[PDB]
Scaffold this active site. Structure first.
Site, short mmCIF file in Angstrom:
data_model
loop_
_atom_site.label_atom_id
_atom_site.label_comp_id
_atom_site.label_asym_id
_atom_site.label_seq_id
_atom_site.Cartn_x
_atom_site.Cartn_y
_atom_site.Cartn_z
N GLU A 7 -2.93 -6.52 7.23
CA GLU A 7 -1.77 -6.50 8.16
C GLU A 7 -1.15 -5.20 8.10
OE1 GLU A 7 -1.05 -9.57 9.66
OE2 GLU A 7 -3.07 -9.24 9.46
N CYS A 17 7.61 -2.26 8.45
CA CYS A 17 6.67 -2.50 9.36
C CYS A 17 7.22 -2.92 10.81
CB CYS A 17 5.43 -3.01 8.98
SG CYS A 17 5.74 -4.79 8.79
N1 LIG Z 1 1.96 -5.81 8.98
C1 LIG Z 1 3.12 -6.03 7.89
O1 LIG Z 1 3.07 -7.13 7.70
C2 LIG Z 1 3.31 -4.58 7.07
C3 LIG Z 1 4.09 -4.92 6.27
C4 LIG Z 1 4.63 -3.86 5.54
C5 LIG Z 1 4.20 -2.58 5.42
N2 LIG Z 1 3.12 -2.48 6.44
C6 LIG Z 1 2.39 -0.92 6.66
O2 LIG Z 1 2.25 -0.60 5.55
C7 LIG Z 1 2.67 0.91 5.74
C8 LIG Z 1 3.44 1.32 4.64
O3 LIG Z 1 3.09 0.96 3.31
P1 LIG Z 1 2.45 1.86 2.25
O4 LIG Z 1 2.84 3.35 2.56
O5 LIG Z 1 2.60 1.48 1.04
O6 LIG Z 1 0.51 1.74 2.82
P2 LIG Z 1 -0.84 2.52 2.24
O7 LIG Z 1 -1.61 2.47 3.28
O8 LIG Z 1 -0.15 4.08 2.17
O9 LIG Z 1 -0.97 1.82 0.63
C9 LIG Z 1 -0.89 0.51 0.69
C10 LIG Z 1 -1.61 0.17 -0.48
O10 LIG Z 1 -3.34 0.52 -0.37
C11 LIG Z 1 -3.53 1.22 -1.55
N3 LIG Z 1 -4.54 2.20 -1.22
C12 LIG Z 1 -4.62 3.55 -0.65
N4 LIG Z 1 -5.75 3.83 -0.59
C13 LIG Z 1 -6.39 2.88 -0.88
C14 LIG Z 1 -7.98 2.94 -0.65
N5 LIG Z 1 -8.89 3.93 -0.10
N6 LIG Z 1 -8.46 1.58 -1.21
C15 LIG Z 1 -7.82 0.65 -1.47
N7 LIG Z 1 -6.31 0.77 -1.50
C16 LIG Z 1 -5.89 1.83 -1.29
C17 LIG Z 1 -2.35 1.96 -2.06
O11 LIG Z 1 -2.11 1.97 -3.58
C18 LIG Z 1 -1.17 0.79 -1.78
O12 LIG Z 1 -1.21 -0.47 -2.86
C19 LIG Z 1 3.00 1.14 6.81
O13 LIG Z 1 2.02 1.39 7.90
C20 LIG Z 1 3.57 -0.19 7.36
O14 LIG Z 1 3.54 -0.56 8.65
C21 LIG Z 1 2.72 -3.63 7.10
#
Ligand SMILES: NC(=O)c1ccc[n+]([C@@H]2O[C@H](COP(=O)([O-])OP(=O)(O)OC[C@H]3O[C@@H](n4cnc5c(N)ncnc54)[C@H](O)[C@@H]3O)[C@@H](O)[C@H]2O)c1
Ligand SMILES: Cc1cc2c(cc1C)N(C1SCCS1)c1c([nH]c(=O)[nH]c1=O)N2C[C@H](O)[C@H](O)[C@H](O)COP(=O)(O)OP(=O)(O)OC[C@H]1O[C@@H](n2cnc3c(N)ncnc32)[C@H](O)[C@@H]1O
Ligand SMILES: [Mg+2]
Length: 1217
Positions: A794, A828
């Site tokens: 998501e 988001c």
């Molecule tokens: N669709 C939804 O319901 C929803 C809800 C909240 C946030 N978001 C999205 O989340 C983003 C912001 O949150 P964020 O900055 O924490 O996202 P992010 O992608 O920067 O990181 C999210 C998680 O992924 C992990 N991560 C980073 N690289 C990884 C990898 N190579 N392999 C596995 N895990 C990895 C991070 O440590 C973290 O726990 C925004 O794009 C927002 O739109 C979506």
């Protein structure tokens, strides 16, 4: 460095005994409020008989002179339908907007009457909801503008110029004379002479919308000041009782009139009220402070107290104050006011009203999950409260001047006899609203009637400003329980109208029982589950208790450690800093080595059978226990979230509520569905984002756990502490340590978990680019059963709101400011692109920029802070680079100035950027940055195209009153969460199931009924998941199969047609004043990668039965299997040699052995754009299992939340009130 929460929410002043007694009653149970009110309202049998006789005489007079309304005579004369009457009044309104009367008459004669009305006159029907109330007595929230256009054409073509002239003259008599006393104060004063001679007095209000900007507050100030001068000149020494006065609305005089901004209210609003009161004093006229929403009552008392103690206002008894009898605090507020009158020596004028915000108060308490309502829920309770409060007031006429504002002849008669025979002008008075109380009160005023004075509340303003007030009055008058509706109802006898509410309440089984058909906020979902509870940040007891708990939370040594099944593991430790002030150390995190992350997955795999063997009901019981623990610990959890994640208190409350709701929703969904045949996947890796560090974290883990899977929980590196606390709570609730392991750390820890051999599923919420990396790593993996590893991903949004010229600017601005800048745009769901119809763009943009500058940005341990920091310096730098690029391109950029104190943290000021084209944006900018584009109305459909063309599809908002525009836009937009006439950041679990499409998500939606089924090997049937509709192309394909002799496949096709839930259309239980809809649509174009002819037929049947089109892999060599397709089916079928050229797809079906599935899965992961939900099966599985391809994942969920109170009130709730 200031101590955390040391200045969180100090009250304006220490709360006296009398003030505390008010606060104590705020949400007191209704059964506890009524008994003392019944006692105080009781009168002698002789008085009650006398009062009933007087009330009967008044009502007999009222019904005896009741003539038909002018609108009704117009409808009768021209045989108009209701829609024709409404359309005619809309036309009249537009024609009255033409100043030159002869120019209007020529337009009527030469153009309008000749049928051509669309040419010469923004929809004509923008205000049809108001005229619908006038014509039908009923409020419809939106306007059927196509029905009205048809009705207007019909009536003009039938009756021509005469009906138009009659409609114009009818509207003129209403807008300029009936609802408003005058369009200017001078006009209103002119019109007041007639009734002042008959013994009436007046109180004028320059009424309008609450201020959303400083400039608008200043405009309302100068309007009030100029009106006081005109009223005082006209009063000419008549004094405060016999002469006219003014009424003012405090929310008109400051754009941030709220308890959260109490310091600005006392510093900025109070001096303005004082200056107006000084002017009222010099002319010796009354100045009444109108009463507004329940969460402004006690704040307004602090202004009343200061003003009444201010020696500069001494010598004047004209200060007045409204109290609302439908409020549970009313008698205690009166005690406070009467005591203040005694202390100050000022005879405070007390306007006792029943209350004007009833339906809004019901909805607000439900939305906020509060303990109870701040108003009564049975209308008769308000009547008893009113009479009891009148008794208190009449006992204190030496120190206050009671003003009994009511149109209810029974209430009036009761007070008239309660007050007794001794009367003098100045002892008390009655009051009424202009244009609706004169029939009753001409039977009251004067020595030939009851010889009691009446003051008329006189609204002043242009027709434009009168609409919001007019809707409330008409909605009130047509309400089920309204005295006005009942006295017009011939099936209501005078005996019923003169029934004594005090005696009716006394004889009820449970005195003071809540209305049977209004749910307490906790009971919104009935037997399904208990609603999470919030906290009332307008309640001083709550604020004082929360202040202590928040300070205590900041004294705790919060830690996050790698919590493996075997116990905590060692690792590299660092501090966790407050993003709003890096000097504020929140805790310490020990992060997970890649070795220990791999070890954790092995431990989860070994623990998987034991957790799977815990019966689903007992797994659900763990979740319900964790929800109870989180509810009880909410204040401490709030404090941690505020400091670790840069959230305001309001946002942290919502965050913890959402976590509680996830736990209870997935527990209940489990109890509804899961049995022995729904086997778990195995170890599930849950990777969560920083921005909802408890809610999304808890939701993913809870779902995976309750589905029977052990979980590896990898929180965002920025927010490990609240995650560790969530895991501690889940473990305390009974989740075994082997079933829930916490692995703090950065993306390398997430990646090590994803890559681990025993990982059976991944739940990811975060950026699209990281999701794409996880998809790629999973593309070379299969389960032991040889199937793809399920991924729920998501991801980001590029969320738009479209606003047309029918929307209310003030509503739009509030919803835009909230949607774009709440949590500094780090939702988001946040509004990224505001789309304004050209004709209203300048006015809304001006208001939006004004409202922008009223936001308080800072460290979030203060109630007064609206917008906190962004999470990191890297996030700040990314956001600021985007702003500067836009500014470098010449785009107009508006930014709030930040306080110097923000320098110790990482803040980005809320920002508005005016774009030329939607293509100016290329990727989600996850910060407080609103982009604004303008559109011409004829280009609405192209604009929806432009919104869809980003490839995202998460949240979307529409502000319009027009049904044609709602139908058009909601049918053409492609997003998972739609919001009509409200903000777009709603994700209430089980009410707006949340999650999008395209670049925004794979689904299924979190907080929805398909979620748990993705976390087991055989999906259960979700509650309410079925559809009686059969896709017609599916049916054509099944017939084509039978014609080709593929009899088994045709049978399978028919079965898929029946099993598909395409077309499911549900309304989900939720708060009043909102309709929350959940529908299943086609996903789009599904990529089919078949291996055999029969496999292709089964794949095609699955895709068509769920409404999809398909692109079939041309490399399959199966083109000859689809000869002579019906055109209806051929239209849905394409052949693809180059899959990356023919997308984007919305899913994929693959047939083959394990190595073929792996190769195809890798090719699919390489396709540009959205992550594809892939389902794979062998040829043998297709032959054996009718559910080899699950139809749950071939439909797309859509949630739509419609604010049905947006037109000014809740029609259905008033009909049961
Ligand atoms: N669709 C939804 O319901 C929803 C809800 C909240 C946030 N978001 C999205 O989340 C983003 C912001 O949150 P964020 O900055 O924490 O996202 P992010 O992608 O920067 O990181 C999210 C998680 O992924 C992990 N991560 C980073 N690289 C990884 C990898 N190579 N392999 C596995 N895990 C990895 C991070 O440590 C973290 O726990 C925004 O794009 C927002 O739109 C979506
Ligand atoms: C005459 C006047 C009125 C007002 C103001 C000034 C003057 C001079 N000002 C003004 S400032 C801007 C707005 S007007 C002002 C107002 N209002 C306000 O809040 N602040 C303000 O400053 N009003 C409006 C009154 O509160 C009230 O709505 C009407 O007078 C109708 O009540 P009634 O005549 O007693 O009818 P009734 O016997 O039919 O009762 C209707 C009322 O019962 C209540 N009710 C209905 N259903 C209920 C239910 N299920 N449960 C519990 N209660 C229920 C509800 O309060 C409803 O309005
Ligand atoms: Mg990141």
């Amino acid at each position: 460095a200031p101590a955390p929460f040391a200045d969180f929410a100090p009250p304006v002043r220490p709360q006296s005994t009398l003030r505390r007694a008010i606060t104590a009653a705020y949400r007191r149970p209704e059964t506890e409020c009524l008994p003392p009110l019944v006692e105080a309202a009781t009168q002698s049998k002789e008085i009650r008989d006398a009062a009933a006789s007087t009330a009967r005489k008044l009502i007999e007079a009222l019904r005896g002179k009741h003539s038909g309304s002018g609108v009704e005579g117009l409808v009768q004369e021209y045989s108009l339908s209701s829609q024709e009457g409404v359309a005619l009044m809309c036309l009249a309104e537009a024609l009255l907007r033409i100043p030159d009367t002869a120019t209007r008459d020529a337009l009527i004669r030469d153009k309008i009457a000749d049928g051509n009305w669309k040419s010469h006159l923004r929809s004509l029907f923008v205000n049809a909801a108001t005229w619908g109330l006038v014509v039908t007595g009923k409020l419809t929230s939106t306007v059927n503008d196509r029905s009205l256009a048809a009705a207007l054409t019909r009536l003009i073509s039938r009756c021509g110029e005469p009906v138009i002239r009659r409609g114009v003259d009818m509207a003129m008599r209403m807008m300029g004379e009936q609802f408003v006393t005058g369009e200017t104060i001078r006009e209103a004063l002119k019109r007041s002479k007639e009734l002042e001679e008959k013994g009436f007095s007046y109180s004028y209000d320059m009424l309008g919308e609450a201020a959303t900007t400083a400039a608008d507050a200043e405009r309302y100030y100068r309007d009030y000041e100029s009106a006081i001068h005109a009223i005082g000149k006209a009063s000419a020494g008549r004094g405060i009782y016999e002469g006219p006065g003014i009424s003012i609305k405090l929310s008109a005089l400051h754009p941030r009139y709220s308890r959260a901004q109490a310091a600005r209210v006392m510093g900025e609003l109070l001096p303005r009220v004082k200056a107006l009161a000084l002017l009222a004093k010099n002319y010796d006229i009354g100045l009444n402070i109108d009463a507004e929403e329940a969460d402004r009552l006690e704040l307004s008392l602090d202004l009343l107290e200061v003003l009444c103690l201010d020696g500069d206002l001494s010598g004047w008894n004209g200060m007045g104050f409204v109290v609302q009898a439908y409020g549970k605090r009313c008698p205690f507020v009166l005690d406070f006011i009467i005591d203040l009158a005694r202390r100050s020596g000022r005879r405070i004028m007390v306007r006792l009203v029943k209350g004007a915000y009833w339906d809004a108060e019901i909805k607000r308490a439900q939305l906020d999950g509060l303990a109870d309502f701040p108003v009564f829920t049975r209308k008769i309770h308000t009547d008893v409260s009113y009479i009891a409060c009148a008794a208190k007031l009449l006992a204190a006429t030496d120190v206050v001047f009671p003003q009994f504002a009511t149109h209810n002849a029974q209430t009036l008669a009761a007070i008239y006899h309660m007050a007794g025979k001794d009367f003098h002008v100045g002892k008390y008075e009655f009051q009424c609203l202009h244009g609706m109380g004169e029939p009753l009160y001409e039977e009251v005023v004067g020595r030939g009637k009851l010889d009691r004075p009446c003051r008329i509340y006189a609204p002043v303003g242009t027709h434009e400003t009168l609409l919001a007030y007019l809707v409330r009055r008409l909605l009130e008058n047509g309400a089920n329980s309204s005295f006005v509706h009942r006295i017009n109802d011939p099936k209501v006898s005078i005996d019923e109208l003169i029934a004594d509410p005090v005696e009716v309440v006394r004889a009820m089984p449970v005195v003071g029982a809540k209305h049977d058909r209004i749910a307490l906020p906790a009971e919104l979902f009935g037997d399904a589950r208990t609603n999470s509870a919030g906290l009332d940040l307008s309640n001083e007891e709550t604020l004082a208790s929360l202040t202590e708990a928040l300070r205590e939370s900041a004294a705790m040594k919060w830690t996050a450690l790698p919590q493996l099944a075997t116990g905590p593991a060692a690792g590299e430790t660092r501090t966790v800093l407050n993003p709003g002030d890096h000097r504020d150390v929140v805790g310490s995190v020990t992060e997970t080595s890649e070795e220990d992350a791999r070890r954790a997955v092995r431990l989860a795999a070994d623990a998987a059978p034991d957790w799977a063997a815990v019966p689903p009901s007992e797994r659900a019981a763990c979740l319900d226990r964790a929800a109870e623990l989180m509810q009880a610990r909410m204040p401490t959890l709030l404090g941690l979230i505020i400091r670790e994640a840069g959230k305001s208190a309001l946002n942290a409350i919502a965050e913890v509520r959402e976590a509680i709701d996830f736990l209870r929703y997935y527990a209940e969904q489990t109890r509804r569905t899961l049995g022995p045949g729904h086997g778990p996947l195995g170890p599930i890796v849950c990777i969560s984002p920083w921005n909802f560090p408890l809610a999304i974290f808890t939701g993913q883990i809870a779902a995976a756990l309750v589905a029977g899977n052990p979980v590896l929980a990898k929180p965002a590196e920025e927010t490990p502490l609240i995650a560790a606390e969530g895991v501690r709570i889940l473990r305390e609730a009974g989740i075994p340590a082997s079933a829930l392991q916490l692995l703090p750390g950065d993306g390398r820890v997430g990646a090590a978990l994803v890559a681990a051999a025993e990982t059976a599923g991944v739940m990811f919420t975060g950026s699209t680019e990281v999701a794409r990396l996880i998809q790629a790593q999973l593309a070379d993996r299969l389960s032991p059963a040889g199937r793809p590893i399920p991924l729920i991903a998501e991801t980001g949004g590029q969320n738009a709101m479209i606003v047309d010229s029918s929307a209310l600017a003030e509503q739009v601005v509030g919803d835009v400011i909230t949607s774009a800048f709440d949590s500094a745009g780090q939702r988001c769901s946040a509004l990224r692109v505001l789309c304004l119809q050209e004709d209203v763009a300048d006015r809304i943009l001006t208001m939006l920029k004004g409202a922008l500058h009223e936001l308080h940005i800072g460290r979030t341990d203060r109630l007064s802070v609206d917008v906190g920091p962004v999470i990191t310096s890297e996030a700040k730098d990314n956001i600021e680079k985007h702003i500067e690029r836009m500014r470098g391109l010449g785009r107009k950029v508006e930014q709030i100035g930040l306080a110097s104190e923000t320098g110790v943290g990482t803040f980005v000021p809320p920002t508005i950027i005016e774009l030329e084209k939607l293509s100016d944006l290329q990727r989600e900018v996850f910060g407080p940055v609103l982009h604004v584009i303008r559109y011409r109305r004829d280009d609405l459909d192209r604009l929806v195209d432009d919104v869809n063309a980003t490839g995202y599809g998460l949240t979307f908002g529409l502000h319009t009153r027009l049904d044609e525009t709602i139908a058009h836009v909601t049918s053409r937009i492609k997003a998972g969460n739609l919001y009509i006439n409200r903000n777009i950041i709603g994700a209430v679990v089980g009410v707006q199931p949340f999650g999008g499409r395209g670049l925004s998500g794979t689904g299924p939606k979190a907080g929805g009924p398909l979620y748990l089924g993705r976390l087991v090997t055989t999906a259960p049937v979700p509650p309410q998941h079925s559809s009686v509709h059969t896709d017609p192309v599916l049916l054509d394909f099944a017939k084509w199969l039978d014609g080709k002799g593929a009899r088994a496949e045709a049978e399978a096709a028919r079965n898929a047609g029946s099993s598909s839930a395409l077309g499911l259309d549900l309304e989900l239980p939720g708060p009043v004043g909102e309709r929350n809809l959940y529908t299943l649509h086609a996903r789009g174009r599904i990529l089919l990668v078949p291996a055999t002819e029969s496999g292709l037929y089964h794949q095609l049947a699955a895709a068509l039965a769920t409404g999809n089109s398909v692109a079939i892999d041309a490399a399959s060599g199966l083109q000859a299997s689809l000869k002579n397709l019906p055109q209806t089916v051929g239209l849905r079928v394409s052949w693809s040699k180059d899959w990356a050229a023919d997308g984007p797809f919305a899913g994929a079906l693959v047939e083959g052995d394990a190595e073929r599935i792996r190769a195809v899965n890798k090719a699919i992961a390489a396709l540009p754009g959205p992550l594809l939900l892939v389902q794979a099966a062998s040829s043998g599985e297709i032959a054996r299992n009718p559910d080899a391809y699950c139809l749950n994942w071939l439909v797309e969920e859509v949630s739509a939340s419609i604010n049905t109170a947006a037109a000014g009130g809740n029609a259905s709730l008033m009909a049961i009130g």
